């Protein structure tokens, strides 16, 4: 068992193996940057805030540990290490997750570097490639936005989740559908792509309803085919009510852009989630020809998420989490 050291940073106390040197903060769980002296790389250290405070928190802790432990893909955040100062289940009350410190997010990049069409292909290609994998394990990200996209000096990308979100949220979510499928993440990708091509936020609404309004003027009022899947009378009227803005046409919002780019965007920003293009199909799209390769776009191992439909006590969630820490095996 490694020897630990203690440190207080922005009134928050950190307890790490001596291996992790030079803790400097970078967010508030809270997160630090450190030097992993084992490999000479800078890493990010997440220390969970109040991990087992309530049944909900405790499940959320177990979840996040399970997710990270599973993600083994180049375009998705992976676990380098998880540790705890605790010598035993009984002492156990802090959890720390370690990952590769990626340089900067997609927001930081766009601000002082002005993307080429070639940049957009490679970047969107990587999100998509990460998603095919994600989605293959029956996981839905749900909060894709440029702050959740890490990009290194070589403009190579990882998807993660730092726990405005709304500009990229699928509309079915802003109307509260409960069902949700995987192509909510495809809507988010089209909001991200849009902005990369235009340099402006596609749906900058002052509130969720103003955004629904701008969503509907561009993509169009729901077609009979779609309204047919909406069980609720009050839902069916309200969507017609928000589609009263003068109709705006797609291809005139994206005028200087590669014609294949606009085509792909028309296939992701489809109102009916059932007719929206999936990550797997998107990768084969002719906009990604310089990059697509089907022998190098894997899917994930089976991910046992039976825990998600479970209600257990705090101490059970905690004991489960503690097993996942002990059993962790790092990558070589
Ligand atoms: C698999 C997928 C979809 C990409 C998810 C990743 C994460 N976690 C993640 O990106 N972790 C980290 C972020 C930033 C720095 C870190 C630094 C070190 C370690 C982890 C770090 C998910 N969750 C669950 C929902 S939640 O409980 O609201 C928020 C977090 S879901
Ligand atoms: C303001 C815009 C109107 C929102 C209607 C968008 C319809 C989105 O698509 C719908 O999403 C559901 C996701 O659970 C699916 O189960 C439905 O079958 C699908 O048609």
């Amino acid at each position: 068992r490694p020897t630990f050291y203690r440190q207080e940073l922005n009134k928050t106390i950190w307890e790490v193996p001596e291996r992790y040197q030079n803790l400097s903060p970078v967010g508030s769980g809270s997160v630090c940057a450190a030097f992993d002296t084992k490999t000479g790389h800078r890493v990010a250290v997440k220390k969970l805030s109040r991990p087992f405070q309530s049944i909900i928190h405790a499940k959320r802790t177990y979840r996040e540990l399970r997710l990270l432990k599973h993600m083994k893909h180049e375009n998705v955040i992976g676990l380098l290490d998880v540790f705890t100062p605790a010598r035993s289940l009984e002492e156990f009350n802090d959890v720390y997750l370690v990952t590769h410190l990626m340089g900067a997010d997609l927001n930081n990049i766009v601000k002082c570097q002005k993307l080429t069409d070639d940049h957009v292909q490679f970047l969107i290609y990587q999100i998509l490639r990460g998603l095919k994998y994600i989605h293959s394990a029956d996981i839905i990200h749900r909060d894709l936005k440029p702050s959740n996209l890490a990009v290194n000096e070589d403009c190579e990308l990882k998807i993660l989740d730092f726990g405005a979100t709304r500009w990229y949220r699928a509309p079915e979510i802003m109307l509260n559908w409960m069902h949700y499928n995987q192509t909510v993440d495809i809507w988010s990708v089209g909001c991200i792509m849009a902005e990369l091509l235009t340099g402006r936020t596609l749906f900058p609404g002052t509130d969720h309803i103003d955004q629904l309004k701008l969503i509907l003027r561009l993509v169009g009022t729901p077609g009979a085919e779609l309204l047919k899947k909406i069980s609720s009378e009050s839902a069916r009227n309200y969507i017609q009510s928000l589609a009263q803005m003068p109709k705006m046409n797609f291809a005139n919002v994206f005028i200087g852009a590669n014609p294949l780019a606009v085509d792909l965007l028309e296939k992701m920003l489809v109102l009916d989630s059932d007719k929206r293009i999936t990550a797997a199909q998107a990768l084969a799209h002719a906009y990604f020809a310089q990059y697509h390769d089907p022998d190098d776009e894997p899917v994930a191992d089976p991910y046992d998420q039976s825990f998600e439909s479970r209600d257990l006590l705090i101490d059970e969630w905690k004991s489960l989490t503690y097993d996942e820490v002990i059993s962790f095996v790092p990558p070589p």
Side-chain angles (χ1 to χ4, degrees):
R1 163 172 186 275
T3 75
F4 281 71
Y5 74 101
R6 256 129 305 253
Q7 181 178 32
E8 166 157 11
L9 300 156
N10 292 353
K11 270 147 255 295
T12 318
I13 162 263
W14 291 75
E15 223 157 328
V16 304
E18 53 183 19
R19 155 178 189 185
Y20 306 101
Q21 217 62 39
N22 307 117
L23 262 48
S24 37
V26 88
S28 262
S30 50
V31 171
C32 283
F35 183 90
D36 182 3
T37 70
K38 204 191 168 165
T39 75
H41 307 149
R42 281 167 189 75
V43 283
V45 176
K46 194 197 190 167
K47 167 196 202 200
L48 258 27
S49 60
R50 308 218 226 161
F52 312 111
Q53 173 135 54
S54 56
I55 286 168
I56 287 170
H57 273 34
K59 181 170 193 164
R60 175 171 308 162
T61 291
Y62 183 70
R63 178 177 295 119
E64 165 158 50
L65 216 225
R66 288 295 309 288
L67 281 148
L68 299 177
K69 281 187 66 160
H70 191 74
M71 300 296 96
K72 286 161 171 200
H73 179 104
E74 301 180 12
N75 299 130
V76 185
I77 195 197
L79 255 205
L80 254 16
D81 194 16
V82 44
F83 61 87
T84 178
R87 272 284 333 271
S88 70
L89 219 213
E90 288 76 22
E91 299 220 315
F92 189 44
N93 212 29
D94 301 287
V95 164
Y96 298 85
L97 312 161
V98 179
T99 184
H100 188 287
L101 191 88
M102 267 266 173
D105 60 52
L106 208 238
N107 265 155
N108 302 145
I109 301 300
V110 156
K111 292 189 195 225
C112 258
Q113 312 204 198
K114 37 229 187 156
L115 310 172
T116 270
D117 186 42
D118 187 69
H119 290 330
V120 179
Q121 302 177 30
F122 185 46
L123 256 16
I124 301 303
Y125 175 75
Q126 279 165 113
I127 304 171
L128 285 177
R129 174 160 191 266
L131 250 32
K132 174 197 199 186
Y133 175 93
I134 306 302
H135 293 172
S136 77
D138 200 354
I139 296 162
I140 287 155
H141 183 114
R142 264 180 213 91
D143 204 19
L144 272 186
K145 57 199 167 147
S147 61
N148 290 154
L149 301 158
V151 174
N152 72 4
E153 52 166 41
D154 293 321
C155 260
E156 285 172 345
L157 176 149
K158 292 177 183 285
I159 305 174
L160 36 77
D161 195 353
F162 269 91
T165 280
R166 92 176 160 270
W167 295 333
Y168 315 81
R169 286 269 226 183
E172 61 263 29
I173 299 196
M174 294 190 296
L175 294 152
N176 185 50
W177 234 260
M178 295 316 312
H179 306 353
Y180 321 133
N181 90 355
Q182 295 167 350
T183 41
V184 296
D185 281 342
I186 298 292
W187 181 268
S188 292
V189 179
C191 294
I192 289 159
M193 198 180 154
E195 162 161 47
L196 295 202
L197 297 163
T198 306
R200 329 224 112 236
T201 291
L202 184 45
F203 309 118
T206 161
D207 50 56
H208 286 32
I209 139 199
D210 183 45
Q211 193 181 317
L212 253 7
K213 272 186 253 211
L214 308 173
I215 285 164
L216 288 157
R217 77 184 183 159
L218 172 65
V219 307
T221 69
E225 202 176 28
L226 204 223
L227 307 161
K228 166 163 316 221
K229 305 151 135 185
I230 305 167
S231 159
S232 151
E233 107 225 79
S234 60
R236 285 170 330 243
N237 294 149
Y238 189 33
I239 68 191
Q240 290 162 264
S241 287
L242 298 156
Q244 252 50 239
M245 293 191 78
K247 166 86 175 74
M248 198 142 293
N249 96 121
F250 224 92
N252 271 50
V253 167
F254 296 111
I255 31 87
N258 186 341
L260 288 165
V262 178
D263 179 70
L264 179 57
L265 275 174
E266 297 189 312
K267 292 178 169 72
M268 298 168 143
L269 301 172
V270 176
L271 210 83
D272 192 343
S273 85
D274 285 329
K275 306 331 204 75
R276 217 131 90 186
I277 189 178
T278 78
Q281 303 174 330
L283 289 165
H285 194 278
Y287 179 66
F288 300 126
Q290 303 295 59
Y291 303 93
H292 170 62
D293 177 11
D295 311 316
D296 189 30
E297 281 156 1
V299 299
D301 293 337
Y303 177 48
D304 158 30
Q305 58 189 324
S306 50
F307 86 73
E308 286 272 22
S309 64
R310 223 61 98 184
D311 320 25
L312 311 171
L313 287 342
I314 279 157
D315 292 324
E316 282 189 299
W317 279 122
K318 169 195 277 226
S319 163
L320 261 11
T321 304
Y322 189 81
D323 295 350
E324 289 292 333
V325 175
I326 281 22
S327 78
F328 175 73
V329 181

